[PDB]
Amino acid sequence: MWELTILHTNDVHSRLEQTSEDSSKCVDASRCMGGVARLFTKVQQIRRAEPNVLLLDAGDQYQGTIWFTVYKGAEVAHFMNALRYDAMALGNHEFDNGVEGLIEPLLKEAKFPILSANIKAKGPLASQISGLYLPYKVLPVGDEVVGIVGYTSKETPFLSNPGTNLVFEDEITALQPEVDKLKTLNVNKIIALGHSGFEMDKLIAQKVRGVDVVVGGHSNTFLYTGNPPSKEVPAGKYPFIVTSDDGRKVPVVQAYAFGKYLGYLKIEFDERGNVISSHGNPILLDSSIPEDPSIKADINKWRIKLDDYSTQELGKTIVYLDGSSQSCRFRECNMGNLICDAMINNNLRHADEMFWNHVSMCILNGGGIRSPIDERNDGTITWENLAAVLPFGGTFDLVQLKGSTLKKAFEHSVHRYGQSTGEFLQVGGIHVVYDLSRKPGDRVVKLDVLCTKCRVPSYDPLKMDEVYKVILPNFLANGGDGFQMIKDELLRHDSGDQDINVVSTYISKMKVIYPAVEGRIKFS
Amino acid sequence: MWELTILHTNDVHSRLEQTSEDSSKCVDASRCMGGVARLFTKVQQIRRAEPNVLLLDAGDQYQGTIWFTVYKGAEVAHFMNALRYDAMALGNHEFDNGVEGLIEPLLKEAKFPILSANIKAKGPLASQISGLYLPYKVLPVGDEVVGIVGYTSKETPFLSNPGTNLVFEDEITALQPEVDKLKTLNVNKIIALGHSGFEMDKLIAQKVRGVDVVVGGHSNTFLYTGNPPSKEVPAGKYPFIVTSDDGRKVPVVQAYAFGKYLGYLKIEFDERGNVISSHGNPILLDSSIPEDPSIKADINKWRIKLDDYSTQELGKTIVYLDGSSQSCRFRECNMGNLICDAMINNNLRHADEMFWNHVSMCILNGGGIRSPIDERNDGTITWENLAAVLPFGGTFDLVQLKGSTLKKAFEHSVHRYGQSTGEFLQVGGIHVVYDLSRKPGDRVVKLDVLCTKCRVPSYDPLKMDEVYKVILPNFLANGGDGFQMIKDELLRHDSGDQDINVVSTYISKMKVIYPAVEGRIKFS
Ligand SMILES: Nc1ncnc2c1ncn2[C@@H]1O[C@H](COP(=O)(O)CP(=O)(O)O)[C@@H](O)[C@H]1O
Ligand SMILES: Nc1ncnc2c1ncn2[C@@H]1O[C@H](COP(=O)(O)CP(=O)(O)O)[C@@H](O)[C@H]1O
Ligand SMILES: [Ca+2]
Ligand SMILES: [Ca+2]
Ligand SMILES: [Cl-]
Ligand SMILES: [Cl-]
Ligand SMILES: [Zn+2]
Ligand SMILES: [Zn+2]
Ligand SMILES: [Zn+2]
Ligand SMILES: [Zn+2]
């Protein structure tokens, strides 16, 4: 039998350094997790112990801390090379700085193949980018060869900045003839590695004949067999087994996000490449694993340039600033309240003619909030802390909407509630109540809004046929996260200030902050 | 028949200048009201027209604007003398600066008699204060004589600073032998003039044999016959007729507060002093009455010293700051929210050890909020604006209370709801719901409070047997407004910063404020 060890990461999102266990900045060093130094130690240990090992990344290394703000992906190429990754698939965040921001820092510097079979280049772009990413790579592993075929979320154009000259084809349609090619080349072991989300991963496993294993990402899925070692709750066993339409058992794996875990799957193949068995579990990268001293020293080197985003205290928090996805995608979270209060404040700083100009209302996609902040380091808030919460460089815009437009937005907010999706709205100037037992599109059972046409602001039931001034991310003003109604029906859009500056100025002005969860969003 | 015209004011509370119609600072001059210049014009007009006129004040001239903060009652004596008042009764606020603060600025300078029959001086004080206020005064009016007997709220010791050497006797008990004396002196026309509240006024009219008319104050009662001319809603006709136990019809009058109206009652007497008939109505002192130019010039003179409390803008509001009694004694008012938010802020500026130190909760007697602020003057907030909202020089203290102590405080808050009484609580860190259809002591149907023993603050049901850190006025920490439970049961009291400084520093820090009514207090 020939045994393959697959070690995999996904949605690392610029956590080059170890982190608190909620993936924010490490403060209590003795209990930190993740980071590429600790990852290295563990991979090294596994490579000593197992003869056939591949280390794979399923995309979304780009975007998430000051590391990326500053080094713009040059840190990704540098440290992925140091860890000796064997292959990476392109994720949507790889395109955030446009194709140019992927070509120059990453594709031209990586020492391993970068993959995606469903991304097709056209127009003036097709010539530059040719050869820089590949549909697949066949890799020698010991005496054998393993084919890796890449794929990338078909909805990257609605998520990132890939430009007008790249086409994202259906993953299953694009993947099949590549896997078919590999088979005619007599490659009988085939891993599909890519970045479309666990639901698409399962369908690729089901539908692409010849795929032996799927290694995926994008949905930050945590899978586990046995008693999970930390706060993440398993969505299924590890590996998750899909039975293909031609009858094969196909393991499907993902390993959460932020470099907190290393996925580890061992696959037993026979000499024809049939999977006899597989097993494993993600490995929690906690402090019981030591940080490699070489990689850590090189991280400390690179870190020097990052220190002046932590040089100044902006303000303090005396409460935990809960920007976790498990809160912000599911209920009112105090990081979302703080941000909306800054957006409204920033506006109502230049307002009042009367009953108009006053904008009283804010909404904010909870998935746009990308990290918590911890109150325990004497509670200091720095530019670096804020940059991990708001890494996209968006702006907070003013939009005018109808009551009816807004009610449909709130129905959209919870239309598929329960899947940790980013559309769930955090708010200010708005008291919404949902009843999730009702049907999608009919779950909003109360929606009050803060009058602006009044001398004392108080909450009144929203009116379907009235018009309202809402502050919200440009992401949302453009129909991001499926808020088609907003793009389609707004009656006015104006651009606003940079997101991080807004929140930063607000914090500096308050000096000490303490946002509560206060019943702006309730469930019936 | 001999016809007497009684012109009366009560609870003027240092509104020497004309005011907006909500009794705050005059900004729109063409629509201002009240003030002693306008009052003078009207009284002058009446004195030309009627031969037998008395101008009477039923107490509480002291305390309410920068006028009093600064001139400490010397302005009261000066302008009451200019208006030629015939008599004043002592009210509770006359004692706010202690007996010394009444003796020196007012009792020694007034050109008219100052009255109270139920205030008895004892100890070392009895000798100083003798002769400076009187139980009654007989006044020549044309060819006749009218006896005026004074009275003062028996609860002045729980309201003001009268010291340990003055006794406040039952008003009816003290009044009867004085009225009896006047009768044996053949005074057959007798006005009881005093400051105990409309309910006590009615009982004096009922029970003190020989009183022909009661002129009162303290409860700011507005009475009117016909269609009221402004926003105040009549509590009864003017005069309000009480039938005495010996069968006489006794008119009882009051004229709201803040010098907005001049009470005007004409009484027809026969030659034995029987009241044949009476009628009148309070006169709204609006801009249709011109300000007397002499008095106005002398007001402008005195005003010069007040100008440097308006020299600096503290901050702006872009909302009306509703500190009216009709709001703050009856529902959540945004001036009460602003004040509690300043109290909590001022504390949580020097806080965090963890789950303790953090004080999350504030309560505030709505009657301690003594004026609104208008947003229309480009919304400027000055020291003078704030001084009329918080004129008492109190402090905001920290107290530790049991859940059970707090629940009884909230029941106390609404135990006699509906009478514009000052105990109704404004709050922060607290979401209370009342059901006024339930019995007194059982009207609180929800009471949630902001955790402090948690890393993210959120609202949880109060627990009867838990302990809570509450910021509140010292007035309340001492059992003011009938909050006996608080004084009696608190488990810790510490003194805090001056009230006006707290709110002022808060406003200066926010720069621009916009407090909403947001459902901290709801009714079921
Ligand atoms: N450019 C952008 N601006 C604002 N929010 C964004 C964004 N890109 C992604 N998001 C938010 O993040 C959510 C998706 O984050 P996930 O972690 O589940 C997948 P990924 O963004 O890392 O590709 C989106 O639903 C949206 O709410
Ligand atoms: N020294 C003090 N400190 C704080 N609040 C006071 C106060 N004196 C009076 N109040 C508040 O004002 C309410 C009474 O005001 P009213 O206008 O009805 C009668 P008056 O205070 O002018 O004598 C009290 O119930 C209390 O809430
Ligand atoms: Ca195979
Ligand atoms: Ca009589
Ligand atoms: Cl998915
Ligand atoms: Cl009364
Ligand atoms: Zn991601
Ligand atoms: Zn992604
Ligand atoms: Zn008064
Ligand atoms: Zn009074």
mmCIF file of C-alpha atoms in Angstrom, chain A residues 324-480:
data_model
loop_
_atom_site.group_PDB
_atom_site.id
_atom_site.type_symbol
_atom_site.label_atom_id
_atom_site.label_comp_id
_atom_site.label_asym_id
_atom_site.label_seq_id
_atom_site.Cartn_x
_atom_site.Cartn_y
_atom_site.Cartn_z
ATOM 1 C CA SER A 324 -15.845 37.041 16.049
ATOM 2 C CA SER A 325 -17.798 35.531 13.195
ATOM 3 C CA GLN A 326 -19.703 33.220 15.622
ATOM 4 C CA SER A 327 -21.231 36.425 17.138
ATOM 5 C CA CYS A 328 -21.306 38.982 14.314
ATOM 6 C CA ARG A 329 -22.940 36.610 11.775
ATOM 7 C CA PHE A 330 -25.542 35.383 14.214
ATOM 8 C CA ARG A 331 -26.643 38.152 16.647
ATOM 9 C CA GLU A 332 -25.993 41.704 17.713
ATOM 10 C CA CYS A 333 -22.250 41.963 18.453
ATOM 11 C CA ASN A 334 -20.683 44.865 20.280
ATOM 12 C CA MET A 335 -17.917 45.286 17.692
ATOM 13 C CA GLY A 336 -20.716 45.855 15.073
ATOM 14 C CA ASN A 337 -22.445 48.411 17.395
ATOM 15 C CA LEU A 338 -19.173 50.288 17.991
ATOM 16 C CA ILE A 339 -18.541 50.471 14.219
ATOM 17 C CA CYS A 340 -22.053 51.706 13.380
ATOM 18 C CA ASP A 341 -21.803 54.263 16.209
ATOM 19 C CA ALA A 342 -18.582 55.559 14.684
ATOM 20 C CA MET A 343 -20.200 55.719 11.189
ATOM 21 C CA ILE A 344 -23.203 57.717 12.516
ATOM 22 C CA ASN A 345 -20.965 59.915 14.680
ATOM 23 C CA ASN A 346 -18.625 60.654 11.798
ATOM 24 C CA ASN A 347 -21.575 61.879 9.753
ATOM 25 C CA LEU A 348 -23.591 63.730 12.500
ATOM 26 C CA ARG A 349 -20.418 65.651 13.111
ATOM 27 C CA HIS A 350 -21.127 67.638 9.888
ATOM 28 C CA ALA A 351 -25.025 67.687 10.215
ATOM 29 C CA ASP A 352 -28.330 69.520 11.239
ATOM 30 C CA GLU A 353 -30.464 71.821 9.065
ATOM 31 C CA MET A 354 -33.439 70.344 10.794
ATOM 32 C CA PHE A 355 -35.393 67.207 10.386
ATOM 33 C CA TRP A 356 -33.088 66.314 7.394
ATOM 34 C CA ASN A 357 -29.214 65.987 7.048
ATOM 35 C CA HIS A 358 -29.321 64.143 10.355
ATOM 36 C CA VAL A 359 -28.736 60.555 9.259
ATOM 37 C CA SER A 360 -29.820 58.346 12.047
ATOM 38 C CA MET A 361 -29.427 54.825 10.712
ATOM 39 C CA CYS A 362 -26.431 52.463 9.953
ATOM 40 C CA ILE A 363 -26.212 48.913 8.641
ATOM 41 C CA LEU A 364 -23.088 46.840 8.308
ATOM 42 C CA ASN A 365 -22.512 43.324 6.948
ATOM 43 C CA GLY A 366 -21.305 41.275 9.878
ATOM 44 C CA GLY A 367 -18.887 39.371 7.603
ATOM 45 C CA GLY A 368 -17.085 42.690 6.915
ATOM 46 C CA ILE A 369 -15.959 42.637 10.595
ATOM 47 C CA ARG A 370 -12.813 40.431 10.372
ATOM 48 C CA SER A 371 -11.357 40.240 13.900
ATOM 49 C CA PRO A 372 -12.200 40.856 17.585
ATOM 50 C CA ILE A 373 -10.081 43.108 19.833
ATOM 51 C CA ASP A 374 -9.027 41.950 23.353
ATOM 52 C CA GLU A 375 -9.450 44.291 26.366
ATOM 53 C CA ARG A 376 -6.823 42.607 28.526
ATOM 54 C CA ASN A 377 -3.564 44.376 27.374
ATOM 55 C CA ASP A 378 -4.504 47.397 29.567
ATOM 56 C CA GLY A 379 -7.088 47.488 26.698
ATOM 57 C CA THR A 380 -4.941 49.470 24.184
ATOM 58 C CA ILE A 381 -6.347 49.956 20.642
ATOM 59 C CA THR A 382 -3.772 50.558 17.965
ATOM 60 C CA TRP A 383 -3.811 50.997 14.247
ATOM 61 C CA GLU A 384 -2.664 47.360 13.956
ATOM 62 C CA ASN A 385 -5.692 46.185 16.061
ATOM 63 C CA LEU A 386 -8.090 48.137 13.860
ATOM 64 C CA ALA A 387 -6.509 47.046 10.625
ATOM 65 C CA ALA A 388 -7.366 43.374 11.389
ATOM 66 C CA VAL A 389 -11.038 44.309 12.158
ATOM 67 C CA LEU A 390 -11.379 46.457 8.908
ATOM 68 C CA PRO A 391 -8.735 45.266 6.411
ATOM 69 C CA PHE A 392 -10.508 46.002 3.109
ATOM 70 C CA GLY A 393 -9.907 49.762 2.712
ATOM 71 C CA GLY A 394 -13.592 50.362 2.172
ATOM 72 C CA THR A 395 -15.524 53.508 2.879
ATOM 73 C CA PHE A 396 -18.656 54.340 4.785
ATOM 74 C CA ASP A 397 -21.155 55.826 2.368
ATOM 75 C CA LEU A 398 -24.427 57.732 2.619
ATOM 76 C CA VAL A 399 -27.367 56.211 0.722
ATOM 77 C CA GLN A 400 -31.062 57.132 0.632
ATOM 78 C CA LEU A 401 -33.486 54.187 0.788
ATOM 79 C CA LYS A 402 -37.206 53.430 0.847
ATOM 80 C CA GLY A 403 -38.769 51.729 3.841
ATOM 81 C CA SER A 404 -39.623 48.878 1.460
ATOM 82 C CA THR A 405 -35.977 48.686 0.219
ATOM 83 C CA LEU A 406 -34.792 48.525 3.834
ATOM 84 C CA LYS A 407 -37.349 45.860 4.875
ATOM 85 C CA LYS A 408 -36.218 43.587 1.995
ATOM 86 C CA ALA A 409 -32.563 44.194 3.140
ATOM 87 C CA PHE A 410 -33.451 42.905 6.641
ATOM 88 C CA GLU A 411 -35.258 39.926 5.199
ATOM 89 C CA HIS A 412 -32.114 39.284 3.121
ATOM 90 C CA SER A 413 -30.004 39.583 6.327
ATOM 91 C CA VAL A 414 -31.593 36.367 7.681
ATOM 92 C CA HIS A 415 -32.999 34.611 4.559
ATOM 93 C CA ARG A 416 -30.651 31.556 4.994
ATOM 94 C CA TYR A 417 -29.845 32.142 8.680
ATOM 95 C CA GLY A 418 -27.668 29.569 10.358
ATOM 96 C CA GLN A 419 -24.853 29.142 7.870
ATOM 97 C CA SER A 420 -22.289 31.754 9.183
ATOM 98 C CA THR A 421 -22.757 33.854 6.095
ATOM 99 C CA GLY A 422 -21.623 37.463 5.958
ATOM 100 C CA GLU A 423 -24.911 39.233 5.026
ATOM 101 C CA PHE A 424 -26.293 39.272 8.590
ATOM 102 C CA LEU A 425 -26.528 42.972 9.455
ATOM 103 C CA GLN A 426 -25.153 44.841 12.430
ATOM 104 C CA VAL A 427 -27.021 48.172 12.965
ATOM 105 C CA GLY A 428 -27.339 51.578 14.640
ATOM 106 C CA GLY A 429 -30.527 53.715 14.832
ATOM 107 C CA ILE A 430 -32.452 50.555 14.141
ATOM 108 C CA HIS A 431 -34.302 48.089 16.437
ATOM 109 C CA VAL A 432 -35.105 44.939 14.452
ATOM 110 C CA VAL A 433 -36.806 41.762 15.690
ATOM 111 C CA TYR A 434 -36.724 38.509 13.744
ATOM 112 C CA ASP A 435 -38.835 35.344 14.031
ATOM 113 C CA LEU A 436 -36.738 32.674 12.399
ATOM 114 C CA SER A 437 -39.633 30.189 12.603
ATOM 115 C CA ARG A 438 -41.340 32.136 9.787
ATOM 116 C CA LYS A 439 -40.504 31.627 6.087
ATOM 117 C CA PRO A 440 -37.492 33.238 4.343
ATOM 118 C CA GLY A 441 -38.613 36.731 3.220
ATOM 119 C CA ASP A 442 -41.138 36.937 6.070
ATOM 120 C CA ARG A 443 -38.940 36.762 9.222
ATOM 121 C CA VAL A 444 -38.836 40.486 10.179
ATOM 122 C CA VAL A 445 -41.547 40.920 12.757
ATOM 123 C CA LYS A 446 -40.629 44.389 14.101
ATOM 124 C CA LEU A 447 -38.503 47.105 12.515
ATOM 125 C CA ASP A 448 -38.295 50.454 14.288
ATOM 126 C CA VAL A 449 -36.137 53.274 13.229
ATOM 127 C CA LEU A 450 -34.924 56.469 14.726
ATOM 128 C CA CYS A 451 -36.805 59.403 13.415
ATOM 129 C CA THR A 452 -34.757 62.139 11.809
ATOM 130 C CA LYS A 453 -37.855 64.359 11.029
ATOM 131 C CA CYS A 454 -38.426 65.247 14.744
ATOM 132 C CA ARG A 455 -36.738 67.512 17.302
ATOM 133 C CA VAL A 456 -36.236 64.668 19.844
ATOM 134 C CA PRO A 457 -35.113 61.340 18.163
ATOM 135 C CA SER A 458 -37.235 58.313 19.205
ATOM 136 C CA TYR A 459 -38.014 55.035 17.540
ATOM 137 C CA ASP A 460 -41.027 54.594 15.299
ATOM 138 C CA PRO A 461 -42.096 51.671 13.078
ATOM 139 C CA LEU A 462 -40.405 51.841 9.698
ATOM 140 C CA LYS A 463 -42.699 52.871 6.855
ATOM 141 C CA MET A 464 -42.708 50.934 3.591
ATOM 142 C CA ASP A 465 -43.388 54.052 1.607
ATOM 143 C CA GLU A 466 -41.068 56.539 3.396
ATOM 144 C CA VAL A 467 -37.412 57.468 2.634
ATOM 145 C CA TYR A 468 -34.450 57.038 4.975
ATOM 146 C CA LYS A 469 -30.775 58.129 5.150
ATOM 147 C CA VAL A 470 -28.587 55.067 5.902
ATOM 148 C CA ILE A 471 -24.735 55.022 6.413
ATOM 149 C CA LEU A 472 -23.270 51.697 5.222
ATOM 150 C CA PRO A 473 -20.148 50.186 3.630
ATOM 151 C CA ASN A 474 -19.618 50.860 -0.056
ATOM 152 C CA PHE A 475 -19.395 47.068 -0.343
ATOM 153 C CA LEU A 476 -23.111 47.060 0.511
ATOM 154 C CA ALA A 477 -24.021 50.188 -1.489
ATOM 155 C CA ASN A 478 -22.749 48.201 -4.514
ATOM 156 C CA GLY A 479 -24.964 45.170 -3.919
ATOM 157 C CA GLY A 480 -22.249 43.155 -2.099
#
